[model samples]
Target chain A: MTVVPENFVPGLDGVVAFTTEIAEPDKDGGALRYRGVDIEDLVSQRVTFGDVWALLVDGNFGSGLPPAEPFPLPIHSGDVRVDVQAGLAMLAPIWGYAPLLDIDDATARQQLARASVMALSYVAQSARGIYQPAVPQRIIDECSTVTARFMTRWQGEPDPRHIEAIDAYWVSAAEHGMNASTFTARVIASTGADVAAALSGAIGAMSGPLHGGAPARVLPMLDEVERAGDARSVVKGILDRGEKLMGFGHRVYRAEDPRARVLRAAAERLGAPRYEVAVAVEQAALSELRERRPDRAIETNVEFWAAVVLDFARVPANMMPAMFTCGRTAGWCAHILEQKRLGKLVRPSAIYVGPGPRSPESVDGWERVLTTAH
Target chain B: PENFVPGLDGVVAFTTEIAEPDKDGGALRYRGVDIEDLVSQRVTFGDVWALLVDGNFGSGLPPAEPFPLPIHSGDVRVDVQAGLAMLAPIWGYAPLLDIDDATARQQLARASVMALSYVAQSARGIYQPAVPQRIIDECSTVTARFMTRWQGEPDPRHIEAIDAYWVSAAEHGMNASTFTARVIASTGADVAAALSGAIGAMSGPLHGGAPARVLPMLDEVERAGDARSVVKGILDRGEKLMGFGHRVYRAEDPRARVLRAAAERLGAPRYEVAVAVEQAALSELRERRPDRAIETNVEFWAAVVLDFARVPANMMPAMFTCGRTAGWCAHILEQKRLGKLVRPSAIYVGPGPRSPESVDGWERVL
Candidate 1:
């Protein structure tokens, strides 16, 4: 008989795979903290994504930014999402080659963290019809921060407000404990695989519709609200049709997502027209959600304001998932490093619901029939 | 914190009917078919793949087209990992959008071909021709295609040995690599993405890195001409006896038995030495740890069989990958069908809700 454990939990919900000093998503308190610092404090202080990345990977907040090296762009697949996926995929082989493979682990980890951000920037720029011949020295000197570099590469100029908005988004998105993609990275890393391998797998997991795909869907809802000029009607129509309000609810957060609060402020600072509509939609959606399902806590998530902030920064809807990956790459790298240090394979068991042991005659009978037919 | 299982050992991640590995019983079944029976019936890897993925026995052979993607790296592992990632864009979005079976199957077939090509390229240098039209059209089995591409022609014995190895390695229950594929697939990712992630997991030393290491142990034993002495020396030095113990199997690994027969059938050059080593190691291991059942695992015989097939030692992991791709693809399909996001909670042991002032040197950032 297949040994199904007595404590079998489907989807592994409430199962602590391992103890982590990384970011924690406290459902009861509805606060997210990375390493010990509140995201609210980081965002309010205007800490760069580079510093947050350093904090996650190096366990310090003030380490200077890692250099973002340029690599050749991938052959476009005519879709921005596909291009971004390909770009992330290319890193595995690129890291396996000479210069990258020759580097020490600490150097590789930092470079890989930055390289992920560069890949997103490269793909996003190529999609926007801005083929950078190279990252100019002036831009390199001027934009020491990851957010600044990404903005300069894609937009050819960096606005302080826009950079600040994206920086907050990246810092908040940097690390979350045991999310699907971060968990995927940890699982791969537990195998003692290289950073590029772990990051590539995490990118694949992030491409899922239920995870990174939500931010892109959020903008469409806001557009629908803008077109109809009735946030409540559109949200109610979506609820009535049994469709999800993509960016409104989170699986972990019982109250409003803490990142959403910080991102909402960032979006407000941008003064984008979409921000006004998003604010109306958030209130309408929350009210409708409360009245319809009062027992459940369906509050604003990071993706809702992330969509407005990204829209204000002029990132296309399709590129939102890639941007999310760009921010989360640091977290993935951190988790990978930690997992490697632990050196245990994250292999869980499965309940075998398939057939029991078959008799020898059954297999013989099938083979006989196949032999006779042939 | 109390429920946290390191490695989630006994925690059931999900339920599956695809593969059942009875560890205490020492049996492995793919889609309810006994592995020993499949080996005896001479089932091709393609048919095993069809059984596992499509739940249909005696279906059409898996496609044998040469890999279409341009290989960027010289290393086989990198090419497979990166190539699968590159393939994600092409077919990774298929299940979430359209859920087309043809596209899924085609992607798996191409990935298998890509793995085989990279392995052969690493063994023999690049400049190899495409698989011939006759071989591609007529004898398109995985082994036949791989042998033809690697060398000029396929030897019948080599093909049979490889086919058995591939069938044996096709699926196991919830292995680290397979689990990685399932986790990625749980996010509604495509087959390529799941398989790519799986390849990354397989690259780790604890999982797929064993088979290649076994050859050196065999070489050491053969050179010393004293199997027991070599085994004892390694154990006395506080090293593991490679290819002896398995995490799942209490008896001799079922695949090891089939592969041992397959290697003998191939008239493997290292066959006698491997058997001698296995006997000596088993005797020493059982005596040292009387309670544990440390029988010869698959890697022991797999090294013999692959060596007979003339595959380089470093390329064994890639060869293993080529076989396991079918299993990863099957699990990916199953995960997508289940449609559950595998978001598990973690026990945060970090400093809880610390103000910025609590951190050292926080004043400088402010």
Candidate 2:
């Protein structure tokens, strides 16, 4: 009754691993929408990062963010809490908590939201200097939105412009159509593991150079081109040498990425110093790419202006992916909830391509083996 | 362009030279060597680790040294178990600092070794002496010595059987956990991160939870007083007979055949009952699934062998994870070496393009 499939397409391109009500990549129409709202609208409306989290999970933070309180831990040493080992080990106590396994659905989602902040707090406390602050639970409860509390913990009332830029940044990053990390989260979740495990797996996926790590290299690409003095020829020379531009092209978009346009606008509004430099590189990279591969539609991606904008926000290059983890955590948590709701292990069958089945006669007999063991 | 292949059923995520499921032949191979042949070699578990890592098992390994497994420590030192405990908390609780990732990578491998010490110690308790140091040393010396020490000196044959199970459980192709590890590794995370993430996937009932399900089924057969009646009742109710059938092999899992031999050899108390249940399940399945090739899998035999190994029933899944952690490392190291990011795009199946104000009753759904 079943027809086994042959020839697996590399990278799983065109394979819809799962149906999602999350962010959709509209390649034909040239746009990206999360929970049915365009990135353009989110940025234009200046929706807070907390609002984006709310929108992702509920399509709106409905009542408010989760109440943050003193969830203390025995400090390892000094004033640090280095629980995460790469992507998996950090959230043990939270995952280990007895209630996590059989938590009520409504309550579980909020705990994940709290853990996202707690995860961010752990990351920050490790990086932050002397006045180390535990992320107040009230940051989620009290602030108008979540990033405001993030800025508050970093020791400042929000500069209106910086907060505004952060709003766009987090919303744009909120959800994407099951990118490596989000899919990872859903896959782990499908196994009925706790959300912390799913989120940690997703974080691992995002840490790759192609996903979150790609943005960190963006500024360097622009700087190197700027140093060479001509964006077009330097780009052309690089292209001639067959290297990819960091912030150009995308796997899902056929035209300009909607998030890229939004971040580009934010870059323009802030008069971001690197904006012109990036724009120059973007133009030449596009032209050069077209000349090289006329059939493909290649253009500036979100990572391009994300470089300029995140620089404007003063995010360090190495910490860029971890910062992205904050916003994406909501989406990852939501996907985990959704996958748990769907309730099936994400196991798929692979067609055997290696060797043929062996004859039972060729194998050792149990009686013969049994006598030898004596 | 995405048609949304649910479960990535036919999609090749990436090319792997580490391990492959030889479907037509019904065998699993690591680095192109058949698992049956590897098991026949009777190499030590430490030797298997070396073989998986660098293509040679014993001669390639470093000198044996007693390393500490850190339950709790003040400063980060290079004790195998303690360093892993300090950093990688696999106990469902535990890290807060971020340091150089490559250094973090080395820390995790040693930490994986420490996980055995940690598990062996925590599961056994102080009734067993200096288990941490003993496990750390014997984890390199031989898996049997380490396991036997944890149990306060059991028979050498049982210890060998336990070592055999660890080797068999070491690796398989891109199953859920291994795939999860590779996916996480593609994102440029450290080995520990990928390994930990993999554990999350492996812990799921559909993946690493398989072997643990078998012993319970043995109890069911015992309660019913006959394997055939219990299996027939399950079939009539449309319930699956666990530990029967596999995702890959249409005939029999080669690993299962090896363990079946081991089961027959050890003469564990439960061995007869297990064999009866397995035979009833398989023959009944053959009649019901005449069109489908159903057979006894690795889980069936893993249960048989572990019962004899004296591993507590509850600790079965954790033991499998500790064994598979080696294979996960091999895949992660391969992934890191490959250096190609495994990010694949997904298509949206929800509502079409609409303006931002398309809905008035928009709310975050529970």
Candidate 3:
């Protein structure tokens, strides 16, 4: 397809949005909704993310048989390899950008999204690793055991109830009405990228500051606004600096984001009053800016509020994106299932512009040119 | 004296011709040749990249030197999931597939390029026991060795084309090139990202798009010319503004010369029609900003133009994956022999916000 808006200006209108629109809009008013009902009322309201998952995914997510004879894997079996943990830790730090490689070892390179996707999945279910293909037991035992271990390391044990919150959050977030990151993951999957690579791209978007960067900034934004800083002044400063307010505006919403509204209500149900104070500051600020910069309309974004809601729910800060990984895991599984059915390599291209360089037989080294397009 | 620290942290000699590109878009004339005319009849994209990087960096890569990787270096490095998974056992998703070990191994591609496909569409391909026998045959061997064979089609022409892109991309003055160029100057952690971080800066719409993204920025300025009104158009309106201005170059960018030349060489096996696109963008920029000094910044045009060349956007990061690979190696090798982990001291200036603060009505949690 010929691109309508050819150049990618980052700030310009999106070209990718026109390609496809899949995924459902879940969550509404002040409650999470999958397909259509309020999720907040799920369990107590006679429900489970399982029912929600089945509704959206077109099938029930079976509780894969829990082992009858559990040779319960002991934690920190010192046999727990350090090199493996080191590799996983390396991911979060180097994740700021893409591509993984140790500079000194020029011959080798590590493509993170692909590697980690496999690592996350394989490690979680240790029995099924490419290095050693065994059976169901190792997979189940290791999956949670390893994940729990990381959680314990990243953030000390919170209540077991806190664990369920992550499950809920992920189930809720997995497939949002045609989000770019998810679509991007699917697109990659369509081309038959390994599951890890596909999810890597999905998770990559989730990891971005503009994208996943919200959770990190929410607490700080709250502190600033709460400490006598007017919402209007803060929001204006952000605009003046050309910074996107984390949870401020989105392109698809007709009214304010329904997801933002739902998460806000949950904060109330959870009694996170700090959320109330944050809301007031944000509203006062957005109004002042909208009134002042009339050209720009400051709206309440999902994140500015989801920050406190997620935090108050006690999800670990460093693990905010992790909630998404878990949430999207369902979709990842679904997409893989779909790709296997109608598989085609995903290949797209740029219009080539060139002035031929001399052939290798004709030149000594790589050429460096000045780009007119630059 | 004000801080004498070089932004690049060392002496990497620069040129003055670049100022013309920086100041007036008119200066983008490659080797003093306008890309418009060159596009109609001139050099290949290879020439464009060559000139952008070398400007006189003593011709280009010496054969003995390793090839540099492209855009996705940091993206691939320092990953955290495996770290967590290795420690905690989080990767429970992979093994459920009952495919034979050989098929599984072939499908996963030995991890070199696993998870590359199907990340979004999880159990789709793998879990479908219903898939036809013919479809499975198509994805047999999982080694990038296929990619190796695929990329191996002996197209000396495409290699030159890629070389042109890489050549121009290989280095820049005071740009992402400078970022890597500067980290090396510090005589420290030549970590690939630190060395290649500027490439990211260049890829960003704000930092490196100056010539490209800036051409649009300069239009309002040249239209208004009054710095006051120009700044105000965006400032007063809050339209957008973090990415303007370059920290170096006394004038127009010299890199434009090579890129324009590359565009001029359309249809040569090593050159493609992107030459015309670059030339057209240059002409449009010149027309809109007449008399203003501005040339396309290499960052703005290279990847997008390459995308035009049928490359994917994700591959832009992957280009760094390919080309900057060399630079990362050089820096890593250098740093391994010398410095400390890049523990640069950053002075905090902002207050730390507590976790989960909310309010009511204006921005209610409920």
Candidate 4:
């Protein structure tokens, strides 16, 4: 293993792809970037999520760098498969990771997603005691129906037929080019953090709707703007109050963002005639920003348009996270596969803030056994 | 003619279907769709589902799809999942959709595929206990008990109505599969991307479970020159596997014939498996995949494998999803209901990130 002087979170070597230039946190610019692109431009510009999907998942998948164990796809198989031993190795000490595989023959009593969900529920039960005393099948059915129905209701906003298009939207949003969750999983996997530990950390991050970026939140944000009746006035009022506008900036993309345009087009194609009202409000805000300040090129991002589409489709506020995961889960699994490839445990360097380790007498469950033979 | 008990709100009436089993028939059927078709056909799955629901929800949706199944097929398939929101029961299924054998075969095939994908994408959160241990245990035991009830021979109730299966399959898990899905999620990278990955894994012998030990006859074909001999010989060759059978079947899934018969009534030809399957099973020892392995196990395993393999692209079949999706949704719902943070004690075995500890070795070496 390559050793370094800085003890950076000992086992999470691949957790981050550190670079000299920070993709995020440019205080001077007060902006964010993904792969060098400004988040501001990325979000506005009427880009569709399909563009982001392409950007995040397309060429970057199956790169073979991280070795996403258990699920080792060679990019061409176009199919998913995992080798369990390697996956458990990726998890290391946790020791209980079981890689789910396809059943040999199946006579499912429900739809594929539903049946699959139920089976996973069973597997989850077999592994850890999960969900509130919920039965495996119960949980699976509910989530399956929940995710499916949530997206369906949201998509139904513009037109129920357009639901097919929404599927493409989900596929597009899935898997970004190595974002935080996958980064965390990979780092943990490298340290042999046990697949659960790595996955658990990633899940923790995904659950945080405020961060790791919710393209979905923007719809509610847009609703706030709509409820305010004026996107421009809202921003102006916020500026007057010195509050930062949410969903306006990103850490990636410098050119006109691709996601903004895609979602804008989606709204136009699938939305009701009333959706156009929100469209104009969004555009006015963007044009006015650059025109008024000349130096300030801030514009309506993808979220603004996505909000239009999502809202017009009647998708609610919290459902976005569930919907987003419907797409992003594919990517997280890929990272797990990559971790197996790296073949090392991630144990980063740490400066203990707590007191020094105490002798056995001080801690509970402290039993140390010394063995000397031969 | 007689007074009947009312359901929860006192607004709806309830009934039981599939009340008992018969020796001559192969499997059971509910309403018109075979038990298999009720969950697989994009149309019939929803339609039969609607038939089982007791009433409309707060969303004002009957426990079935508002639209008719024939109106929209694959282009507008709405799977019956649970827990992301209340709308699932409101509009996730289609009730009383007519399913002929052709449709049954197609939907069943499709549902199998969906289950594989769903499990692969969703198994991670399936195992976490977000609710109180008691509730979790209660739900789990209920689930296990329900499965036990569901598994052995055809239930007499199945013929009368599907309330039993639907209610049992629709319990609360509290831990959404969204988190646990990372276990087998195949494509994309985020949790959403991995959502359907867990299904197949869970369904697989190595994961979810072989429906149940292969029927005794299946194993016997490999052992005795009759059925047992074939199974044994196949096992000897290190090929024929026992994971093919299901715990639910007393004698060929009685449900299959009901489905076939329904299709026959619909003017659709009977959907039959290769005639040689059983004969092949009697002579050959085999695992379900790749070919020629006859026997009920072969059929079951093949569908499980094929459908799940195709899960990453779009949705898989709906039947398999029944096994795991409801659990996942219930888990999410339960977890969300708790409002308490899910936190576990962590044991630090390595140095922390960002700051490094100065070792006493520095005193000796430096």
Candidate 5:
């Protein structure tokens, strides 16, 4: 007989797996909070991404400052996301640099969180065939903040509007509740691996087309809409073909996504050239989605405006996921520490639906020779 | 609030046709074939791995590829599992979203074995050219490759011993490492990404990490010539007997029984001592905790069997990873076929929904 558990829930929908204090995204209420403060407040107050990372990781707004020393960019896969993944792996103890072995867990975690951003900046710049200075000159004196440093490393200069836009995007994309990438981090951390291992795994999960791959595609979708010169037709064509509108709806968030609102404002403040087309496309997609699926709340998610904001900051489309990784590394690090403290292995069960058990003698196998024994 | 399950205990996360652990029946099977029969029939690790991933036993072997060693030198201590995770992506294997499922599975399985072989040799300070060899079985090739790098030749006994260990360690039902692989795979990530995450999970002390510690207990018991006193002293000090009880098994672990037989056949040096220690620990545990079914786990005999092959104590867990990479690849493919995101909801127990007006002194806390 096939043995299946009575309480089996597919994809664990609505099943509470963790009770976390990191960030709360309320669907019905349309409010996203990190460490008891509203995301909008953080964005409006112009809090740096470093400060936001400090809030999530240390339960305070200004602690856990980013390290000044530059991390080595050893691997060059020509892909920024893959380089970030390799950099995260290099933070693992013994398998990585020698200094990581002597550092404490908290210090190692901070360095890893910083390296995630650094790798993205350094790799993206290198792929453009841009000349890079020494690590000390590239980081220490070039910029005063993490957002400014990312911009400086990428383009060799930074603008105030671009820095503000990226800061908003990073703060909004920092953390959410049990996202696939964050969950991957916690599962790896539950194994008692180092923080770098956990974050590296998280980056792998984030590389999937279904997760962090969306933001990169969002800009292309907007480009298509602009080229067609008909937002409604483009949106309807995508929906009629049974393809998802790239940034319209979210898995959670019955109401409009709060991060989308914060990023929309950031995009507006930058006055990006594509802002008009993006707004037109968002309105058209929302109207079409509401008409087609009135039973469900389908609205613009964060990726909609995140695309515009990153475009304003001149980040390439392919590197959007790495940028997302840079923002979410703090959340991954925080969740790793929390999982280690909890000290529980996240071993869930699977029901077997295959054939009933049978002895090997009863089966008609082709051969059973001992391949290894001489 | 009341529905939150800590560690997701007893909660069914998904359905699989790969393997099943019949806890009550004291049996474990991979794709409906009893592990006991697989062991008795001397099925190679390649055959079983093919059986689970491709649904066919005795599938043709795939050619093995050489993995480049990392650029580290000297006698620095390196964690094999961590090293594999760190170097897999650097060696040009990563989550390729554009590749077909079957190709991805094959490439990942190949990369996993080659990467493990690379790290295993590197950790022992062995750096030699990866010479091309005739393809045998998966376990044999892995063992041969590592042995050829470490020493100049491969031993048949060591190959057979590791083949049996790999066949047994190839798959178990919904283990923590396997679950971690499945969870990462559910995000539509490729096999390499999923396997890396699974390796991270295998490094934990509670999972595959337990095997390395088993050798120490066996060594202490061997030196003292008293299994009961050593086991008793360990238990009396409130320390857990690492290889005795299991999370899923009520009776003796099925793989442990297989590995125990293998260890006996190999005439492992610590085989008799391990048997004596098992008996004494079972008796002591039964008398102390009458409610629990404390029995010998796979790690107990695994330690002895690997020791017979001259595997170092610290490398035991890495060997487990080398074998289990096939299972991780299989589960990754299966989860990808399922095509469901493994995003589970969380209960927000932290303080939130605090408005901007309410945070009067939030700036001062920094």
Candidate 6:
């Protein structure tokens, strides 16, 4: 039963692709922390996206967050979140159009950090109509953290009640252990390619149905329950029909996904009447899961509460994935940096299990070409 | 040892059928079709793409007619190369761009076709997927059309040699970019994501620069005019040869055999000098590092064959990237069929765990 190439692990389950100092998913203890800070406590501390970003990008553990930097607002763009969008509009085309591959590591780090902020701003702008607004730099600079700055740019100013939830989103999402997009970033980084290229690829991976793409579906699920007028019955019927309850189950965590805990708190603070509907739906889904298969454990995942908090922030559901992409940017930068430090090519071998040893003359099946005589 | 697998060495990264070496180590195959057979037939580039994607060479190979993708031509076209470049940003998400997986594949295929068109513009002249009459009518193969475009005239023999060069380099099993493509695709991501990621992976020096770097080494050997002296000189100077050994191949590279034969077919002075250099370098390399299994790699002959075909040395990797897009897309499609998330765990080898209550300065702890 020794592992052979022919019988190797699929999806690299339980396999450590590489070592990292980024974050760990202590699934057994129901804790997912960034760097070394518990996500739960970090959010409760009201840390900003800029604070978490500085920690993740700087790669140090233990301490207060460093001072926030001004957002890399797109040139000729304004205070509104849309300005970031307008900037990416110009930068994205320029970024992709370059044929040159010699962009060194030092230049790449600065460009990517700016790129992440711009991506978040761009997504917010797109959520609104095409008319771009100039979010003032003073607003961004005066703000103590990224969460507050994003709130200021996203709206005219921050609503003190809802601002806590934005901080929660940043803390909960700053990193996860080698998730799809994070892994995508590391893979590209292993080769010493451009960081911007890695970010672009990661955006693609994050757009998939399974990863960051799930948040957009969360609110829609809750709506279906409301429209049907019975949370328990809708939950039961959906489970009986053998379809996934999008935001409930997770791949990594057997118990409640710890990030869900932080988002649930955010949901409670900002999600009022809408929050109640989510709670009812969650109870019904849990009840159904317990009854359907007592042996299996399924709980609310981050996406479920993520959609709730994002909804509270007035971010459109359709753009939730794009918004999440913004949050994960620094997370990716951290992983890519760690990968570069590892400093070896990540070209592992593959098992060839196709049609084997056919005759050279015949295109169809034929006898062996070599007898392994050597 | 169990905790640390540096470079994931010898680990089975994933399963691949895009290409793999034969057990005897003499040749590789594209989805079980032999490279020797594929190259010797001098099949259309379109036909080779079909074999890679559909897992069969097909009952009737499509006419080598102009690509007819309708991409390169139009009343008002932005520079084809620049147009292809601008598409990257909006290609961020398929659905957002109003594309599904099927449409994404078509667009990627269109881009690959358009890539060659750009190669034509940057290396030759104006646009249109069917700009070359031979490329459209299937009268002449893709390589001939390419050579015709590059040289401003067609040469059938050079075309034949260039055709062999591409088929030889079309795909290699689960290289860095292909692996990147698959890793992204496994998450149910679109071809745009996978393809873009693969491009990033290929940009690495270890992967894309191999052939390009060898072009200069070939120039050095030609200038020296004595293969043995150049080889001894390079070794004595404590420098490494650019395209001598492969990470995977212990024996002679399979692609080297095909490319070297093509180099001989073209029979240019450059190729002739390169032939002698290979002999001296291999002999000297073995003599110096007796324990190491170093031998001539595909990049050496690839450079020779391409340089003979009049491909500028600077554009070596760029041409390789364009040629490889077809192969990368094929791998992406295959990986989409797997439909599994490529998410893996990472062990924390750096900072140790801290108490949840530690909200002090993180910078201070390090």
Give model 5's docking category: medium
lDDT of 5 by residue, B2-114 (tens): 65557787778888888877877888888788888877666767667777776556553454555445535332122333344454445565454556776766666676666
Each candidate structure's count of clashing pairs = 0, 33, 171, 252, 0, 16
lDDT tens digits by residue: candidate 6, B8-125? 6677867766666663566678776777766655565555665666565542222222332222222111123223433445444343134455665565665565556555555553
lDDT of 1 at A197: 65
**Candidate with more favorable, higher TM-score: 2 or 3:** 2
Candidate 3, residues B10-113: lDDT per residue as tens digits?
Answer: 22222222211222333223323333332333233323333333222223221111111111213332221232222212322122122233332222121212
Whose DockQ is greatest here? Answer: 1
lDDT of 5 by residue, A185-238 (tens): 887677666666667778777877766535736766787987889999998998
Residue B73 deviation, candidate 2, in Å? 16
Range of the 10 consecutive residues with the lowest summed lDDT in candidate 6 chain B: B69-78
Candidate 3, lDDT over the whole model: 0.36
What is the C-alpha lDDT profile of model 4 across A294-341, one tens digit per residue?
A: 765565555555545545545455444434544554455444554454
Q: Rank the candidates by lDDT, best first.
A: 1, 5, 6, 2, 3, 4
TM-score of predicted structure 3, chain A: 0.60
Interface RMSD of each: 3.7, 7.9, 17.9, 25.1, 3.7, 8.4
Q: Considering TM-score, which of the candidate structures 1 and 3 is the better prediction for this target? A: 1
TM-score on B-chain, cand. 3: 0.39
Chain A TM per candidate, in order of listing: 0.85, 0.81, 0.60, 0.53, 0.87, 0.79
Model 1 alpha-carbon drift over 4 Å, by segment = A1-7, A78-138, A224-246, A249-254, A292-296, A359-374, B2-4, B91-93, B97-135, B220-240, B245-248, B284-292, B355-358, B361-366
**Candidate 6 root-mean-square deviation in Å:** 6.6
Give the lDDT of residue A161 in candidate 5: 87
Error of 2 at A108 (Å): 4.9
Model 1: colliding residue pairs? none
- Top candidate by lDDT: 1
